[PDB]
Design a protein around this ligand. Sequence first.
Ligand SMILES: CC(C)OC(=O)C1=CN(C(=O)c2ccc(F)c(F)c2)CC(C)(C)c2c1[nH]c1ccccc21
Ligand SMILES: CC1=C(/C=C/C(C)=C/C=C/C(C)=C/C(=O)O)C(C)(C)CCC1
Lengths: 223, 6, 217, 9
Amino acid sequence: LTPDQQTLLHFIMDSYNKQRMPQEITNKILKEEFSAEENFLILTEMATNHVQVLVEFTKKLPGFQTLDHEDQIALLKGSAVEAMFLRSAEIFNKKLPSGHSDLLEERIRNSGISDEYITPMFSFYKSIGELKMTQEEYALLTAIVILSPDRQYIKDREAVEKLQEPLLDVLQKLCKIHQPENPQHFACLLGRLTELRTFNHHHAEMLMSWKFTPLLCEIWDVQ
Amino acid sequence: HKILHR
Amino acid sequence: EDMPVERILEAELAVEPKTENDPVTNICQAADKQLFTLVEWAKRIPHFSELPLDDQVILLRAGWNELLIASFSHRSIAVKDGILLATGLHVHRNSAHSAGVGAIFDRVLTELVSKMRDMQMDKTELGCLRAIVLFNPDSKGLSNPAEVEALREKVYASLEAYCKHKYPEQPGRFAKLLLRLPALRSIGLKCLEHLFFFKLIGDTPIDTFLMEMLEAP
Amino acid sequence: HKILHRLLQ
Ligand SMILES: CC(C)OC(=O)C1=CN(C(=O)c2ccc(F)c(F)c2)CC(C)(C)c2c1[nH]c1ccccc21
Ligand SMILES: CC1=C(/C=C/C(C)=C/C=C/C(C)=C/C(=O)O)C(C)(C)CCC1
């Protein structure tokens, strides 16, 4: 893959790595057998910290800043929730000690969120787990989630499209390289993009079926 | 919006 | 391949052509009519009927909304500022806005009709897309997800195959097609929202087979 | 159940 594509990848990878380590996140939940209603406070905080690092990550995307300064707001709050689930999936499937993996699962299930919404998540996490994705594939796919031209209130759709294109070509090539075992791994991936839209759709309804930080009220449209 | 808009 | 794109194309052609008062009721009329044709379309898709019986039920019951929306959006390339129903009616954009549902209607036009036209999307690609939507491993309670996923990958392979030979000076056509599927999912979920509301206020003739798809089984 | 089951035969 071209030295211009190859150097673009590195800025994404550098930017992506400013995230909290999976171990940090993992640690915060499985440490102390929490109150069901304090798990909410913890999860709230994580998502708030995710949004903050996510905003920073989007700023440095080539060239996100050339876009309309109200289409950036559309892009962000149109992808924030989807970005989160992808990152959770990344975290959940990172290898853990004996018994810690299942303990995490059941602690999330014991958070007041309904099994209606919880069973679909762990099935989606189990789903991307079996794709045995690399860190690079994760971050390029997150970037493709953010620069999705079909979000709401996007005044200039064609601008976003042409920003998204480059990333798809890299992700295609990377898929060939890291996984020539699975010849349709690239497509399998874009498949997951679809499934992430159901999380976007239901998120509002999930939270209201059982507070929030200022940044979360805003980017999730909740109270 | 407010926070988010910088 | 073991997923022949012409025999998928056959399924597309062998369930369509027909030339020849509320906006929403007319769409719901058309939706019901087309659900019957849909089942005949599903069997015509390789290896579909060969799956378990309760699995075929779950696939069609999960993706019927996206599939129908896909297939009327491609028909509506001819028409402009509107949609062409399977009953030979034209539902105009402006008529949609006044019937309450302009926002979801315009999204169908921009993200599905217009995009389909602008990339001159052919019937083989439509069938392969719909075949993917049909083979949804994520569907709840289905017996053998791996069987479904496997069938989906055969469609992917074959749709890529078809795109490189038929359009070699567009290397990223295959991806660009696949990116309609999320937009399709988001619209489909919004159209089910709207339909669940229209069912529950009573105001709309919802016929039997459309009703069956909306009531939890 | 009724309608869908039937057409699948
Ligand atoms: C991925 C990082 C950023 O952590 C998260 O944001 C969340 C991850 N979520 C996880 O499932 C999750 C997965 C693996 C983890 F290690 C983890 F800590 C959290 C989702 C959810 C919906 C429980 C959640 C999350 N935050 C929530 C806030 C409110 C209400 C619910 C949530
Ligand atoms: C997009 C749209 C909707 C469609 C619902 C469904 C499921 C339509 C399927 C129509 C068919 C199947 C037409 C045809 O075949 O001609 C509703 C009413 C919710 C909102 C406004 C317009």
